[PDB]
């Protein structure tokens with residue numbers, strides 16, 4: 001129900017994972033830095049996290065091979081319209097082979113919504129992206145990807 005994200009060197013982020021073994025904290029490696037993703041109903045364990053509310057979810061955050069974040073900046077005025085489109089989402093992605101999980105994350109510390117998808121492999125995501133299933137913006141959207149460590 002909340003998701004906290006933080007960024008930094010994998011070496012630094014690993015210390016947080018090990019400090020909190022009873023929390024489900026997922027570490028993945030990206031090009032610029034590594035990421036921790038912590039889903040919980042409780043409080044953050046990160047210094048100055050990015051905090052999000054979960055507005056749609058399918059699947060468990062476990063040991064995915066690949067993660068993709070669509071980072072979509074939405075104006076304050078556009079938020080109601082943007083969020084309400086998710087009730088109308090096709091609902092196909094969660095049925096594609098190699099899919100593990102999706103979170104649609106409402107940002108509480110910025111304007112940048114995250115559509116987080118977790119996949120068994122990078123190929124599973126590539127197959128989805130090539131398939132049939134798949135102003136209110138403050139700046140252009142961008143995608144970040146991360147791999148299992």
Ligand code: HEM
Pocket residue numbers: 068069070072082085086088089090091092093094102115117133134141143
């Ligand atoms: C290119 C990176 C993107 C990825 C990986 C991505 C991923 C997704 C996923 C997984 C869904 C759910 C599909 C389903 O329910 O079957 C979705 C739907 C949606 N996406 Fe994206 N998306 C991206 C870009 C964007 C951008 C730039 C926007 C800006 C508006 C956007 C707006 C939406 C909206 C409003 C929905 C709700 C369903 C719909 O109306 O199509 N997406 N997207």
